[PDB]
Design a protein around this nucleic acid. Structure first.
Ligand SMILES: [Mg+2]
Ligand SMILES: [Mg+2]
Lengths: 574, 564
DNA sequence: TGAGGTATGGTTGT
DNA sequence: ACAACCTACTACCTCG
DNA sequence: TGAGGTATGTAGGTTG
DNA sequence: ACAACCTACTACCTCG
């Protein structure tokens, strides 16, 4: 617990001058007139050809450059069709930084000023908003930049160091220094004053409590102390390498885990090979009939297509599988212990759970996956307060990133129904998580149905980009940092390792609900530690979202047609 | 068989003159030169703007008009952008109607000639290839192509009792032929074969599937059905209860009828009652409701489905004398509960038949399969569809769906089928079945691939007497028409057009099994579908999944025909 | 939703 | 473009 | 396919 | 357009 302070990778520069607060307003006339759907990009294009610092404002243009130095008359080309533009100055409109509407226009002007000013910088490498400065192959050093306006009417610089390959992670502290050096170097050159780094109040969240059969510090420990909830299991081994039976150290480790858990284990061997064709599927069917819940596949590294085909084939017989490549030595403990954890999660075992109290006893994550011209919208959930159960539900095919209102609700209803099957009652409050942005009204129906059903809720948008960066004012950088920014918007540093590079905090937006922000940050931060198939490192995303992202990715890869007979408690996609 | 003869709605006109056989070739020069996506359509626009009777041929142009009366130099506004074209005549090339490529060009020229010559008729109503001759207005749709014996061929279809349509077809054929200077049209005859009448079975022989309600079902098992009333009324209407009871008495199977005392208006508590019902054994639900809006219907269906309960809707008000409607609803209910209402009796080359279709009307589709297992079609099954970008079903998807129907046969019969009949709705895209075809060969399963096109088959009229269904008309090698269904009061029939894509089963045997398969469909009591049951089921499967979503089907048995 | 076929904006492929 | 298929809704009439 | 995040560079998408 | 998110593969290092 505790208040503390951090720097963001943003820097206050000079106040907008009186001039800039009243940008020049210009109307645009185009011949011929564009259709209703094509005009906005066209206005933007006009904004560029006019030159100087000019952006679209409403249906027209705003410029910080007087109209005499703009190119008021000229020509454009879009989708084959050629247009002729003329810009008529129409006085200047006083823009106030408080009216977030106006500020947005000022920030657009600010970015254009920055990009533009940077193009005129001598002996430096500029690409859009990137600048490279420090070294027939070469390493280039620099930063990605941004410029907007604070509501008190001053320039804000976001700076983040970056490299350029022309022919790579940075310790956090180094990145912080280079961030400052580059912020001043550019502010002094740009003519925007001396940069002063922005501070924010940060709060240190309580360390979450992870439980196997007993307390653990990492999920891999459940292999020695026992699982959070063990039950009678049967696992099968499929060897693609022509070898023996179970490697003894794998056997001994599984037996040890189950003995500590107080549950019984049956180990099977599949004496079949997929090159047998349909006979192979018969063996699977039999294996399944005999109780096998998941399969460990020992194989030389497989090509993606073979891997996918194999997974899909077992899946079609209701058998999740965990691959572990050979050659395999006993000393490669991390790899094979992670494999083992994978197998157990795919068998429907609860390896770890959290201890502690949280606002919501059901947490659900929503994502969309697939790289083709259609996506899958899907959900994964953590049931009970402890996250005592991890489930997935069948995805749905959709046109794009938006998940249809009815689909969101249906998925949600399945997870609620899972809670009701597992606890005998409805949850009093649910935590709804969305990977990335929530499209307008996407959750409207669902939200209404929960209300109707007497279930309290919170909606939280979780963005993996856009949060910027956070550095301690003093001391070492630790994860579990909560940084409230504006109202209902906050950063959350969930994971950090000194060797990984510099952390990227999540950016969260509280979209609906009245749970205090700090509480949401507490439960989400804690949720990152629930993921069972990573032994030694916690995911950045809370387990519902991490699982959901993996779910839609695997379904995107294998297809949805194989999942009919796969239990929703078996996490086949880890 | 009995051999016989039919007219097609095609008419032989004059042989191509020695001049039409050596069309002029022209080279096209465009400025600027187009990217890959714009060149073929751009040549087509140039073909039209040159005028006369000109078409794309290869990378250039062919005209039956000399270059001197074409607009050899001009411009093309395309996507508002702009190309300048010049055509350079490069002598003529002889074309021969026997090559099928060089011929494809002659037919293209023929269609253009037809369309062009029709525009220049006065005072009739022309729309592309359609003309309307007095009376709204009445007329015909026309086509022109080239036969391999190198003669023009006219398709004419008024745009009716079949006899009327035939008459009008003849009238319009001659009226057009002389007027267009193509000579006197003489209608084409084709040898047609009369297929054996399929033998449908319930508990015993039936002529229609609805008869299984009186004589008993092909295979009955102990069933439980539930009733959901959205109308605020009683219990089971008595006539429905008697009819069901009667059907199961005849079948020798026991029936248990339940009532759901829940309303969907109770939200989740309603889902609980569903779950409870399903545990107790309910297999399907009959829903008595006032007519529902599409969304409410979809939502309701999907909700029951999510608890693994297929549903049959029957609208109130309902009167006992509306026997067709409610008997059909009853047949639906039973198919959705997994009963085999009817099966065929006979010997077919393939003891597994599988249909493939794609559905959905959005930017993506669902590729799905439905099957008839056993030589009698003793089982009808669906498989979980897959999301895909367009009409093409991916090779691996085709094979996976197929493997599930094989596996259904293996679970039912305890062995692999000796030969399968693979049916594709619409055309088969290039190598769509290649992987599946190879897999079957590696498993020692014999196969046939048949493309089934609902349009393109044209029309068939008897030379003499009344028109009856189950007409097989071979055309070229491997292609054939199949008249599967007809009634007088529906209008003139539309033969299916079928292409034997892979396999060595004789065409007549394919036609036999396919024709017979049209009678297997259990949910239509009084009228057989045009498509054979595996394709009809499959078409309906991808339609319903395109409507509800695929997310509801995980707990729904693949023997329960929820989409009928 | 009762069912059937006959009537009147999209995908493949060159 | 365009050839040749297709999607899915509608109304009509009648009940293999 | 061992797992995580952090990095570049692909090659590029959806929402509004 | 473009702003601001995102998809999914890759290599690196190390093992809460
Ligand atoms: Mg994995
Ligand atoms: Mg029905």
């Amino acid at each position: 617990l505790g208040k503390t302070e951090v720097f963001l990778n943003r820097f206050a520069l000079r106040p907008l001058n009186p001039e800039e607060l009243r940008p020049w307003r210009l109307e645009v006339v185009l011949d011929p007139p564009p259709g209703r759907e094509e005009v906005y990009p066209l206005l933007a294009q006009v904004a560029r050809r006019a030159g100087g610092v000019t952006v679209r404002m409403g249906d027209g243009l705003a410029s910080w450059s007087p109209p005499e130095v703009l190119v008021l008359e000229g020509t454009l080309a879009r989708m084959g069709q050629t247009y002729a533009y003329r810009l008529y100055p129409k006085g200047r409109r006083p823009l106030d930084p408080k009216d977030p509407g106006e500020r947005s226009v000022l920030s657009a002007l600010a970015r254009r000023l920055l990009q533009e000013r940077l193009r005129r910088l001598e002996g430096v490498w500029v690409e859009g908003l990137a600048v490279y400065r420090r070294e027939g192959w070469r390493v280039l050093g620099g930063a990605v930049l941004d410029l907007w306006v604070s509501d008190s009417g001053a320039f804000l610089l976001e700076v983040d160091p970056a490299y350029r390959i022309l022919c790579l992670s940075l310790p956090w502290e180094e990145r912080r220094r280079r961030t400052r050096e580059i912020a001043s170097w550019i502010g002094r050159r740009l003519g925007l004053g001396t940069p002063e780094a922005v501070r924010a109040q940060a709060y240190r969240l309580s360390i979450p409590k992870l439980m196997g059969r007993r307390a653990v510090s990492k999920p891999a420990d459940a292999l020695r102390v026992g699982f959070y909830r063990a039950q009678e299991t049967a696992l099968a081994l499929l060897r693609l390498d022509g070898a023996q039976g179970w490697p003894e150290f794998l056997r001994r480790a599984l037996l040890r885990a189950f003995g500590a858990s107080g549950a019984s284990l049956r180990l099977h061997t599949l004496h079949a090979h997929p090159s047998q064709g349909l006979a192979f599927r018969e063996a699977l069917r039999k294996a399944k009939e005999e109780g096998v819940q998941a399969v460990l596949v020992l194989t030389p590294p497989m090509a993606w297509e073979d891997r996918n085909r194999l997974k899909a084939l077992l899946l079609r017989e209701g058998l999740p599988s965990q691959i572990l490549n050979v050659p395999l030595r006993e000393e490669e403990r991390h790899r094979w212990e992670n494999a083992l954890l994978g197998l157990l999660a795919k068998a429907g075992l609860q390896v770890v759970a959290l201890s502690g109290a949280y606002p919501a006893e059901l947490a659900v994550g929503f994502d969309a996956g697939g790289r083709e011209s259609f996506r899958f919208g899907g959900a994964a959930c953590a049931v009970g307060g402890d996250g005592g159960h991890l489930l997935w539900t069948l995805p749905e095919a959709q046109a794009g990133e938006r998940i249809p209102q009815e689909v969101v609700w249906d998925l949600l209803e399945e997870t609620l129904w899972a809670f009701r099957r597992k606890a005998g009652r409805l949850p009093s409050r649910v935590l709804l998580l969305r990977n990335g942005r929530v499209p307008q009204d996407e959750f409207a129906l669902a939200l209404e149905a929960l209300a109707r059903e007497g279930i309290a809720y919170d909606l939280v948008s979780v963005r993996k980009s856009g949060g910027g960066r956070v550095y301690p004012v003093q001391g070492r950088l630790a994860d579990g940092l909560y940084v409230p920014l504006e109202d209902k918007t906050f950063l959350l540093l969930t994971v950090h390792r000194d060797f990984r590079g510099t952390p990227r905090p999540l950016k969260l937006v509280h979209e609906a609900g009245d749970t205090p922000l700090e509480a949401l940050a507490h439960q989400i931060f804690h949720l990152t530690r629930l993921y069972p198939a990573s032994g030694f490192a916690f995911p950045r995303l809370p387990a519902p979202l991490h699982l959901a992202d993996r779910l839609v990715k695997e379904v995107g890869r294998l297809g949805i047609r194989h999942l009919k007979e796969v239990d929703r408690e078996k996490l086949f996609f880890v």
